[PDB]
Every structure is written in C-alpha cells, then in structure tokens.
Assembly symmetry: D2
Homo-oligomer: 500 residues x 4
C-alpha cells in the first residue's frame, strides 16, 4: 500500500486561487435559460469569483451598429444584451473576467472568421473607430454598474492571437498594435482598470517575452499576463468527435512554473499571472471531459496549480457551448463541469470536494492533499487517475491524521467509475442522444458522489485511515469532532428494537 503520517504542524498554506475563475461559452449563450440555471446551480456549489468567455464584441450580443442618415454614417452602441448578461452575472454573484473581442462585422478589415458562430478574426479597418468602441463600452459599464464595481473586472485583450485561426496570420506585431490602442483606450476612461494579455496558448511563450518587452519599450501599460494550458496531443476529427492522448498532469504544472519565470525575469517581475483557460483536451468534443478520469486528473491541478499562478480558469463550467455547432447528445465530450440538464460530470465533484479544504496545508504529494480548517477539523482528498491501461489500477492507503479530538465523526465522499459516473449509466441506457425526462432523472440520481459516515476514536492524537482507491477514484474525508449526546436519552438502548 501507501503509508503516510500527516504532520501536525503547518508549513505551507493552501489558497482558494483554484476557484477564482471558470470558463464559459460565448457571452451570447448566457442569454439562454439553460445557461443561467446551470450558472446558478454551479454557484450554489462552487464559489467562483469570475467567469471568462469570448464574444463580448461579437454580433449576436450586438453592441456595435451603424446608422445611415444620408451620407452620414454614425456608429451606434447597443447595450440591450450585455446589460441583461452582466446584470445576470452580478445577480448570481459572479464578476466577469472580460475578454475584449472578437471583431464586429461592420468594423472588420477582412472576412476570416472562427468557430461555428463565425467570429471575425481580422483587425479593425479603422483603429480610431475601435478605440471609441472600447471607450463607449467601459463608460457604459461604469454608468450602469458604478466605477467601484467595474474597477474589479480585469480586461484580457483578444484570444490566442498566436494562432492563425484567432488572429489574421498570427500577426504578432499587429496584435501588439491592437493591445496598445485598446490598453490606451481603457486607461483613458480610468487609469486604474486592469488590462493584460497576450492570451496565447502553449507553444509560443516567446510571445509573452515579446509582449512584455513591447510594453516596456513602447510604454504600454500591463496589469497581468494571460495564457492557456492543455495537455492533449494531436488527434483526428470525426464528423462527431476527436480522441486524444492526455499527457500527465506534471507537464501542465511545468508550463505554469515556466511562464512564471519568464515574468519574474521581465521588466515587470511582479505582474499577476492568470491561466484564463485550462483542461485536459482542448476540444469541445472529446469524451475525456465526461469521464471519471478527467475528474481524478484535474484533482492534482487544483492541488498544486495555485502555487505558481494567481488563478486558473477551468474551461468550462457548462456544456452550453457552440464553437463546434450545437451539441448532439447528452454526453459529447463538452468542456463543461456540468452536462446539459444540469447533470454534474465527475469533474464537477472534484471542485466540490475542494470546497472542503482549509488554509493550513499539512501534507501533500502527487495524489493527495490534507488540510485543516479554522475549527481544527481535517479534510483529506486522495485521487487515483489511470493514465494507461493497467490490470491493477487500485491503490491502498493508510494515512495517520493528527486530531485535536478523541472522538472523531467521519464523512466520506467517493467519486469513481462506479459512483457519480452519469456517463457510465448513459452508456448503460444505450447512449441516448435525446434522453427522456426519466432517463435524465436517473442520470441526475446517479450523478452524486457516494457518502459514508462512520465514527472512530483517535488514539495518541492520531486517527488512522485505511482505504482503497479504485480506477480514477477521488475521495474526500472530513474528520470533525464528535460530541456524543447519547447519555441524555434516558433508557436509550437500540438492542431493544427488533433485530438490533
């Protein structure tokens, strides 16, 4: 097995940076009833601070318009939708991690678009008009939400401009020009608004180096660096899905650690660092996302990720997504922590379990995290992902947890391939594309972790836990102080009940 003796003293500290932000589909989809039910649902379980998605400036949200009064062409800024959208984000208690872009149609210089919803990926045919666009939006936000509020929303400029698909010809030099005009426009409204970039994705860190040199040398303000991180190798698309190999979690944590260095060695060594987007597969159609595997895999990233970054946003919170057309089945490898019909995927409970963690970090290794809360209670999260096809995935443990109590109440929650695996049951049902109300209900019933309570006594100050982790399992133990009130029940004796 694997024996461990969790030390009674706290050296390091565990932060809630893992729940600072979550990813989402384009802001236009936030108008959907399904979207908001899920957001509320998710917020009642995980207290994410911000939400990050594309499309703020796309035409479905329809902010940028133009009116013709003869020969005169004046721009018109329509806020009917982002108002409703941002109003609903705040109502639920979540701030927007604004991402400026993409390029509105009546402002584009080219015709290249991206995704099924076709967002324009070309630069403005007139940066002057673009600058006024940006300023008109911020002023409006300030106008409706107050400067104190807006001041808390960071502004990421564009998305993966290092890719030909998101930025015309990956024109690095043009991006920096976009960054400057926008960073300037924003700071014009209020010098305190947070702005950053480059929003690139793994495999072009030189972009961040140039991005930071560019700002220093051209005197462009930067408030934070932005980047994405995934671990899926190349795969070939089916007209339905893609399967990819997932590199171990270690390689993502290195990318975090790496880009951290590039920042501390730049002219802005103290800039905050935000992984504005992460997950295993970078495709909205890879079933890895629906598997109990994805949950055990991410478990580690939530465990260590916060040591190197200021925040890392899981892409995404819901399957309400359209980049590759409308989903075509209950389960389809969508990014979301929650599937359609608010059916929590196992990855959802990994996040849920981390709500149990406390400030004091007592122990931690590649597959386990043990912390202590304010009240003195302890919580442990172990996870056993199976990266390969082993015959014996199992893993036994025997952890000695220190406890300031003698009588310990134990609450155990388990998530593996047999528990909290709606995807597995979906298969049992025959992979229905459009399940019926009852199939959906059965799924919802299955989509809950297994809970086991118990009650042991800690001797010599330590409680010894023994347990086995099945394939891709993830377990959480919360050990609190048990204060028995049994002696208060005059005549209490369960043995006086038939069979007990």
């Amino acid at each position: 097995m694997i024996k461990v003796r969790v030390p009674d003293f706290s050296d390091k500290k565990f932060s809630d940076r893992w729940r600072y932000c979550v990813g989402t589909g384009r802001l236009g989809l936030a108008l959907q009833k399904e979207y908001i039910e899920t957001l509320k649902y998710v917020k009642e379980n995980i207290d994410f601070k911000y939400i990050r998605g594309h499309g703020l400036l796309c035409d479905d949200v329809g902010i940028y318009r133009e009116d013709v009064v003869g020969d005169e062409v004046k721009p018109f800024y329509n806020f009917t939708y982002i108002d409703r959208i941002f109003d609903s984000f705040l109502e639920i208690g979540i701030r927007p991690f604004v991402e400026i872009g993409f390029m509105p149609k009546k402002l584009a210089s080219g015709t290249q678009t991206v995704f099924y919803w076709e967002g324009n990926v070309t630069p403005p045919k007139d940066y002057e008009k673009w600058s006024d666009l940006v300023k008109a939006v911020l002023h409006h936000f300030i106008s409706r939400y107050g400067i104190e509020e807006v001041l808390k929303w960071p502004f990421e400029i564009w998305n993966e401009p290092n890719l030909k698909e998101f930025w015309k010809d990956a024109d690095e030099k043009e991006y920096f020009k976009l960054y400057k005009v926008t960073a300037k426009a924003i700071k014009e409204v209020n010098e305190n608004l947070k702005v950053g970039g480059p929003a690139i994705c793994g495999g072009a860190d030189y972009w961040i180096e140039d991005f930071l040199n560019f700002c220093y040398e051209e005197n462009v303000p930067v408030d934070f660096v932005s980047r994405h991180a995934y671990t899926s190798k190349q795969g070939e698309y089916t007209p339905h899905l893609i399967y990819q190999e997932i590199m171990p979690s270690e390689y993502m944590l290195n990318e975090f650690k790496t880009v951290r260095e590039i920042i501390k060695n730049s002219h802005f060594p103290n800039l905050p660092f935000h992984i504005t987007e992460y997950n295993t597969s970078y495709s909205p159609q890879n079933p890895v996302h629906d598997t109990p595997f994805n949950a055990a895999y991410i478990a580690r990233i939530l465990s260590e990720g916060g040591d190197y970054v200021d925040s890392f946003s899981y892409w995404t919170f819901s399957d309400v997504f359209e980049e590759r057309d409308v989903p075509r089945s209950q389960f389809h490898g969508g990014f979301g922590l929650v599937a359609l019909n608010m059916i929590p995927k196992p990855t959802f409970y990994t996040f849920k379990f981390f709500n149990a963690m406390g400030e004091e970090m007592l122990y931690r290794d590649e597959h386990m995290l043990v912390t202590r809360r304010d009240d003195g209670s302890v919580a442990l999260i172990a996870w056993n992902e199976v990266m390969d096809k082993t015959e014996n995935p199992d893993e036994d443990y025997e952890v000695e947890i220190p406890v300031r109590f003698r009588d310990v109440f134990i609450k155990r929650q388990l998530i593996d391939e047999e528990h909290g695996n709606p995807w597995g049951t979906w298969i049992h049902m025959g992979r229905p594309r459009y399940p019926s109300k009852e199939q959906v209900n059965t799924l919802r019933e299955v989509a809950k972790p297994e809970i086991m309570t118990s009650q042991p006594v800690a001797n010599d100050g330590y409680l010894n836990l023994k347990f086995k982790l099945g394939k891709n399992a993830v377990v959480l133990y919360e050990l609190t102080e048990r204060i028995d009130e049994s002696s208060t029940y005059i005549g209490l004796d369960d043995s006086k009940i038939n069979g007990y």
Copy 2:
C-alpha cells in the same frame, strides 16, 4: 438461496389503495411552516389522495366560540384557521379525510382531556348545540369549496371511542348517540356526504358489530367502517421513549381480513373499509419508526394490505407531532415517514419504491412483489426485514423475470442499514438532539437510496436477476427496454480514452 420464475401472465391486479391516505398530527399543526414544506415535499414523491388527522374541532384551530351580549349567549363559528388549513391542503393537491372531534371547551360536559395538547374527550353538554356546530362547518366548507369538492371528503366520527382516554368511560352507547346526532346533522346538509365509524382500534371488534347493528336497527346512515391497526406489544414508558416488540406483519393482515368478514356478514355487506391509521408501534416515541427495519416491515403491508381494505393510512407522514409534547431530538421514534428538516426516514423510500409498481401483478410472496407497467416494463420490490436477532440475516435471490425485450436497461435502488439510513449516521454523529445546519445537510445527503444502473440481455424472453438482501434491506428493480443508439456516434470508441 431463493429461486423464483415470475410468470409471464397476469392473474391478479395491484391497486394504488396503499397511497389513498396518510396520517398527520392535529390539524392545528398544519399551520406550521415546517409542516407544509414537508407535506409538499412528500406529495412531490408520493401521490397520497387524502390526509387524516385529529383536532378539527379542538380549540387551537378555534372554530367554536361564544359571545356574551348581556344575558344572551350566542355561538360564533370562527373559520379563519381551517380555511387556511384546508386551502393549503387543496393547494398541494390533497383532500382531507375529515375526522369530527374532539370536543370544544365551551361545549364539553366534563374536564377529561387527552394528549399533551389536551383535547376534550367528554360528550357535548347539549347535543343540540353540537349538531348546529357540525352543520355550520359543513355549510361553510360547501360555501368556500363548492359542493362538488366537499362531496369527496369522507367524514369519520370521533377517534378510538373504545378507549377510556379518547371517550369518557368508553361509553359505547353514548358513542352511538354521538354518531347518530352527527350522522344526522351531516346528512341534513347533503344526503350524499360520506360518513362512518366507529374509529376503534384493535381488540374490540365487537364495537364494529354493535356499530353496524345499531345503525340498521336505529336507522342511522353509514357509508364506511373505520378502524386502526398496530402490532406493538406492551412496553414501559421512559420519560423519553418506549421500546416495544413488533409482532410479525402477518397479524396485521389478519386483522384486515377479519374485520372484512364482520362487514360482509352485517346488514351492510358492501360498505367500504378504511384503516384510517396504521404502523408498527402506536407510540410517537418508539425508535422503531426511524429504523431501516420499519421500512422493510411495512413493505409487506403495502404489498398485501390493499387486498382486504379500501385504504390504509400510514400514521404518519411527518414527525411534526405533539401528542407527547414537542419532539426533543432529530430522531425520537416519531410516526412520520419524514423526520424534522425534511429528512426522509427509510420507511419513506418504501412508499417511494411502490410508485414504481404497475397494474399487472405477475408474482408475489411474503417478501417480494413483481409487476408490469403499461409500457411493458417490469418492476420488482424485494424486502428482508429481521424480526429477531439472527447471526445470518442475509438472503440470496435468483428471479427469472419475463421481458418483451432483448436488450434490458436496469435501474436498481437499495435501502438497508448501510444505505438511506440517516438514523445510523445520526448515531455516528453522537445522536445530536439539535444538529447543526451541516449535520442536517450530511443527514439529507445520506437519506437517499443507493442507485445502480446496469445493462444485460434477456435470453429466451427472460432476464435472470441475482442479488443479496442485507439486514432489513429493501430493493427495487425497474427493467425497461434498452434501445441502443451507439452506432450513431461515428468513430465512437471508449478504448481510445486514457485507461479505458
């Protein structure tokens, strides 16, 4: 083990008489927020048609009042509370199985009361005034709810008048006088209103014989017979609780069968028969009610009870009860199917599981019920209660269920001492009398049955199920037709996912 080959043809039929009615605490408690949340909660899971409780005429509901205008003493009927009460019963979609009584204070002839809330158990000092009371209430009901509605509410006269505690000196002859004056008063308002009695409890069936002879001979209208049934022997009260031996279920079913005969041999052989109240222990403080045992025990009664009676009301739906003062702990042996804070006891899921049963009864024995629904799907409920203290409570099964399909989707739900046993966890926690919000949450999380899906194939038209029932376990299997859509997912291959 125990092998069974469920026949493919249906002889007998299974009815929903088991869910016709449920018991409740005095109607005054229906004013409590806690009460109504629980009623709604329960109705969303079990479609009970009627609700039966005492106190309609007690003073907390305050219908009967008297005003003094000098020497003149006129009665005043206050409907502020039963209006709200009955309005809320209908809003939720449940009809009242009205029980006239007890005796209001300003109408009583004695001072003897019953229960902690002290309901007057003496006859009216003036049956004339009582008759006008009854008529004024019915007219009001008719007035607010319409005659079509009221016409559906049966009226039970008094409660266990065979006991000295509920009726002064158990005056049988006086009861019949009460019955007549009331039965007459009611029929005066509308000859179609349903009325019956004697509402006695086990061990005095001669009361029903005399009750029926009395009506025939004195020409008093009867529309239904009423009686209670329990199976707890004598026990000694603690200032906190009582423990009692529970006689096997067979003896309750005999009482049903028995009183059935007494009716078919009377002058009114076709009168409907209502067990307006039943359960294992007749005390609101016997922990048997909170145990997974009670659930497995009642399972049988829900299985056969309907063969002999028109309805049998489980006493009660909630622990919102006060007969023996306010409860003093999360679990205290209350009658309710649901404990305070809407925590379902295991007995609750027995009822829940029976919602799965269909009209066609294929097989049935002392511990198992197997039926078929309209769609052709099959549902099975097995139960293994442990009446004694055996070392090997287990019981294996191997049932051959006939199926009109070849591909079968299976949904299994299990309730035993390890699953859906909040009471057990309550013990783990140290029997807290006033649990904290989180203890209550853990309980709610534990208070759900275990669900397992799977997917086998039926060969030769039969699917073979093998399974073990632990101590006091109760399981439900729903076998529906599995229509696989997997071939629609181009390139679908789970083996292309890390570890699968």
Copy 3:
C-alpha cells in the same frame, strides 16, 4: 353622452377564440431566459392555447445537418434545441402552432435570405431530402411527446409565400409544390395531423383561391386556411423606427369576413380559418404598439374577430424579437404585449380584461362588450380609441345592466393614457435606452391598471353605471353579488374611529 340598456336575455354567445393563439419571435429565441420568464408571466395572466412563430427549421435551432464520411454525405437531424424548446412550451402549458420553414442552409437552392437573422427563403435543391427532413422531425416529435400530443399541433406551411422576401420571386406555383411535398410527407407519418396554408398576408386573396383549387384538383390534403392581417399604411423607415397610419379596425374585420366567404365558396367550405398573425402595424419598430392607443384599438378586434375566424394570433406576446436586429431601447415599437423586463404594455391588459368575459353575450357595439358569467355576474368592457387628433376625445356613458341581485359589488379596472401607461412614464424619465434597475421597477409599478371598488344597489333589477372614457381609455366592470356580513360584527360602528 351614450345611453344603453343591456338586454337581460342572451341571443349570441361569446367564445374564447381570441385566446386560442399568440405570436412569438423565431423559436430560437425561446432558448433565452428572458423569453421563457415572459412566456410564464404571460401564461399566468392569459390562457393562450398555442404559440406561433417562424424558424423551426432555421439553422440557429440547428435541426438539419450533414456528415461527410469520405464521399458519402448523410444527413443528420439534431433535436437538442427543439426538444428543450418544445419541452419548455409544454411545461408552461402551451402547444406549438407549428410553422414549417424556413429553408436550412445545407438544403437551400439559392442564397436569398430574410430578416436580420437571415433565414433562407429559397426552395430545396432536392425536395426528396426536404421530405425526409419533415418526416424525421414529425417522427421525433411523436417519439418524445406521444402521438396523442402531436396530433393536437396544427402545421402551417411556410410564411407569406406571396411576398418576394419570404419566397423566391413569390413563385406561387412553386409554393404549391412545396405545400404538396410537405403536406404529403406529414400525412405519411399520420393521416390525422392537421396541415394548412398558404400563410399569405393581406392583398393577395387570389392566393387562397388558387391554393384551394390547387388542392382539390391535384388532390392535396388541406385541414385549414392561414392568413395574416394588419392595418398600417405605407411608411418610411428611419435607421431607428417607422411611423404609419393605422386604418380603423373595421377594415380588419372585413378582411376576416371576406376570406371567410372565399372559403365557404371553395371545394372545402368547412375548413377552419386561422389568422395566424395580426396587429396594427406590421413593423417591429412602430411605437404604436407601446401606446395605450394600440390597446383600445385591439379591444374591438378581440370583441368581434371571433365571429368570423377560428382563431386570431396577436403578433406578438413579447418584445423578445430580432427580425430587425436586437431592440435598442426599453420601448421601441416592438410587437409584444409585454416589453423587455416583463413590463406589460397597455395592450396586455386589454387581453387581461377579456379574461373577465363570459359565454352569454348580452350587448355589443363598436366600442363596448357586455357579458354574463356562469355565476350570474356581469362584466363590461368599454373602450375609446382616438384614431385622429380630436380636441375632445372624451366619451360619457350610462349603461343599464340587468342583475339577478339587489346588492352589487363593483370592481372597476381602467387603462388609459394616465393609467397603465409605462410608455408615458418612460418618456417622463427621458426615454432611457437602458433604464436602471429602479427605473425598471418604477415602470413595473406604473404598468398596472387602476382599480376602483364600490358598492351600489340594483333597483328594478338593473344597476345604472355612469362613467367617462378618456383618450384611448379601456375600462372593465365586474358586477358580482354582494352578500353583506356586517350585522355579524357585534358593536360594529366605523363612526367610533377618529374622523370616521
């Protein structure tokens, strides 16, 4: 003034055909949270049976797709969205008055589109593929909702094919070919499904004549005729709005009466007739829709319209609309009975008031409707729209209403330019485009009719009502029987209260 003596006897009868159906924006918008809140809101006030809108087959709903597996091109029908959409329609208790169309992109033969959302207006490049599309959808509906349900949904083929904008070159002969292939496809699935057309709009009734001759002669099944009706003359668009003259209501009622004749003189004289769309202005940007005028104007149509048609659907129930891009202000002349943020426009209360009408029609003239309910109570609705710019819009009345009671309780609700005129207040506020939460609240507070109760006595069986209707006012009077219980309050005397 205007004196009237409502006769005590009922000749004609008033039907609820006015609430059979309502219009809506494209079905895709039904995915919006805003949309559904409003639908629920509206359904709680007006019991519309069906809802009619375009876009069932447009690409945002995304039903029609195509997968490429080499050289093989197989079609794929995605039901993820209409399932959610139709599921939510039924959840709220409203049936879809299905309108097949428009033309999906991967099936179109041309490139001509209509509206801001660009629905393809060209015929299929292969009617064979189109026929399979239609059949696949109906089978799916049957599959999820059951044949008994679907059988209640009528199917209208296309929209205004008489206009070059909705049908390529208004090819009448091509439309009939579309109608036939579709009507055949539908009837193939189930011979009982209701289907009809031509869905034309005023000024081309010859289309209905040819449509009916075409079906008779070519043996194409028809189950109902479909047409639209508006009364707005030509107007010139602004890049923001359009103003149009509204012809009196008489001309719309004639169009109803007219097309009725064309049907009774055809080969199908008994076919039902549905005005699947109506209102004053046919533009989603004419402020007439937001004015208390529109409410008084439609009042008449709800009064007489049902005499000539089987149903007439008000276009539309909500301002959640996108035909002319996203709205750009709280009030913008949208079709909806309800403005964004669920602010009821005055037209909404006209419909609300008609919920008061009963079966027995006692009196009716060009500006007043008087009916009697089952209980014998009477309800009156008078309205005074101002079509021109008069100096004295007022109108006095003096109606003698017959009453089976002597003591009458009166409930009066008034809607005019001073009451229930959110639009007016919006102006007061300075026409904010994006009102704040409180501005929206004030509007919601203003957006309610004025209510006045009173209590007179009917002498000689008649109650005399005297009242004045302001500009565009609309009033409703409900006279019920007052049963005074005052004598039950011993010592009741309001004059014993300071000042009374």
Copy 4:
C-alpha cells in the same frame, strides 16, 4: 394653502432609527407558515433590524421541561422550537430583540395567567431554577449561533410588570428581584450581553426612576431602558371589538422626550432608550389599525420619534396574533402593518415611503418631512391625518424644493382613503369574514399606493410642487435628475402616431 421653501442647506440629520425594530405576536406563532411568509414579505420592503415579541419562555415554544426518574426531578431544556424560530429569523436577515418571559408552568408559583394563550404571570417558585433556565438558554444560543451573533441581541426582562395582568400584583420590589437574578444570570454567561428594562407602559414612569436607582444602589447592571407608548383613551370591549379615541401624536412624542430626561438625570445618563412597543390603540381589535388614518397618524411619529429614542418598535408587523383569540375576519383591528393573506394595510406604506428618506434633513414640520439622498436627489413625505370630523379635511401645499439639476423626473406615490385602502374595499364587498381567493386578490390589487410620474424643469435651482392632500392622505415625492436621451432616436416623433 400652505407654502414652504425647503432650505438648500442641511442642519439636522435624519436617522434610520424608525426601522431598527418591529413588534410581533408570541414567538410560538413564528412557527406558522403564514407568519414567515409575511415576515419575508415585509423584510423585502422594510429593512427592520430586530423583532420583539413575548413568549420566549412560554410552554408552546416548550423550552422548560422536567423529567422524573424515581424521586429525582431534573429539568430538561428543549430547544427544538426556538432553534427553528431563531434560525428562521436569521435566515430572513432579522435579529431577535429578546424579551425574557413569561413564566413556564413547571416553574410558576401561582396560577394567574394573561391573554387567550394563558402565559403564567407569577414569579418563579425557585429563582435558583429560573437562573439556571436563563443561563442554559443563553449558552445554547451561543452554542448554535456563535458568541459574535448573540452578542448583538439585546435582552429585555419581562413585560409591563407595572400592570397587575402581566406581573402578580404589580409587585415592583419583586420585579427588581427578578431583574437582578436574571441580569446576573445573563452577565454570568458573558459580561457583554445587553440587558435592560423595566418594560413598563405609559403612566408609571416612577417605575423607571426606581428601576435605575435600584440598579445603582444594589449594583445591578443595566444596558438600556425599555418602555411602551400608546395614545388610545379608555373604551368598552364588545365581544368582537373596541373603539377608542386617539390622542394627537404630540402626546406620544412628549412621552419619548419625557422619559429621555428621567434617564439623563439618573445615575446612568447615557443609557440607550428603546420604545420596545408602540402604536395608536393598544388593543388587537380596534379597526383604527386598518384605516388610512392610522397610516397618516404614525407618519409623524416616524418623522420625529427618532430624535428622542434609540429605537421605537411598531406593534406589530403582522396580524398573525392571538392575544385575544384567533382573528375572526379579514380586517379586525389587528396591530399588524400587514393583514392576513399578506394584504398591506395603509400603515405599511407609511413605513415603505420612509425608505425613500435620506441622511440630510432639509425641512420638517408637524406634517411634512423633506430630505436629500447621497446622489443629490430629494424626497418629500407630507401627510394629512384627520383627528376630528371636519367638513373640509383637504389641505393644499406649495413647496419649493432646491435641486442641483435643471431637468427633474418626478415619482409620486399616494396613500389615502381612496388609494391603498383595502379596508375600504373590504367594506364595499360587505365585510366578508372569510373572503374567497378572488376577494383576497382584489384586495391585494387595491392594497397598493397610487403612482404618478411626471417631468418638470427646475428654474433658479428650485422646483415648485403644488398638490392637495385628501383625508388621511400620505404622499411621497422623489425628485431625481432626468437625463434625456430622446435626441438619440433618429426620426423620433410621437405626433406621427394615430392621435398623438
């Protein structure tokens, strides 16, 4: 008329002391669904900080019990109900202004009770047992709610001990003994808990003098003085109601000012002062409470009361009351700001209107209050109660309000005998005792103030308001800055709409 020129500069300041606390029926009634719906309803409109009521220790809540184990008699403290009660108070966001008392049955020394619910009004037969009772409760509160929370709850000892009905023989010397034992018991648990008294009612201030001398001389801790205030003269009870003359508001404000002096001249000159209970009539059956008069009368007290006291609690928030048996009609002169079925009485809107007031008090006289909010907007509340039976109750005004804007948006809300007078309509209906669902709905529809918006321009910095106050009327004007956006609507011209 009455001309006034509100000064542009702020001398005095207006506080929210008027909304610090509200009265309630005994805590046991807080278990009622009706009670809590109303509390929530009320809290969504008025942000009361605390809630004060009797019965914490009465037997329906059932805290104090005793178990017999032979000859041994140990006390048992049951917290099942106050837990639910206080839990629900905090859930809604309202703190309890705890009032210790009355005397539990198994602790009483006499048999004298008070009210329909019979609370024991005799002292403990053993102060030792009583002291342990108090301490056990506080420890439990601390235990479940945390010391930081409980520390915010003030503790008032007993109720009107100056009356023979609430304290045996009004034994002043015994009360002080009660006060000491309790004040000591409390301070034992935590020296910081707030405690005070004497809770007397008008006409015995010498009690407060002795109470303060008693504490100083006997060294008993005091943290606040407590007293009640009413203005209803003697009246004679009917078996249904009582009518009383209401002395002008001036006399209540004097009582406030008076008792203030008695405190500043005592040995504890800085003790806070709480009018833990006030209203016009001190009877739960005087229709004055339901009249628009009561609303205009209290308007003044909310205006000036805060100048002399730390808080004054309106008795009560709801008609959910039982002191004089269960109410017997929709309107019955109950204390509540809200009648049963959540129908706001006019007094409710007086409180609602004061939510509009700001910190800066610009002007104030016996019938008007004018303030300015942070944003610079102004709000005015005028009221015209009719104390006598005048032929001309009317009162004209002409106020000059200073405004930092030129374009002013006006929102006017009016409450008088014709608007927001459910009681009046109730009369119209014939004073139904048990209204039907629709009668209740009409009432709810009538029970709203009249709102009128408008839009004028302020010249020379002042806006001139002219208006008439009807009988017992109460009006609120909120003048905010109007920022017109009309010029943004290209082609906007309402005159192009039929009739405009």
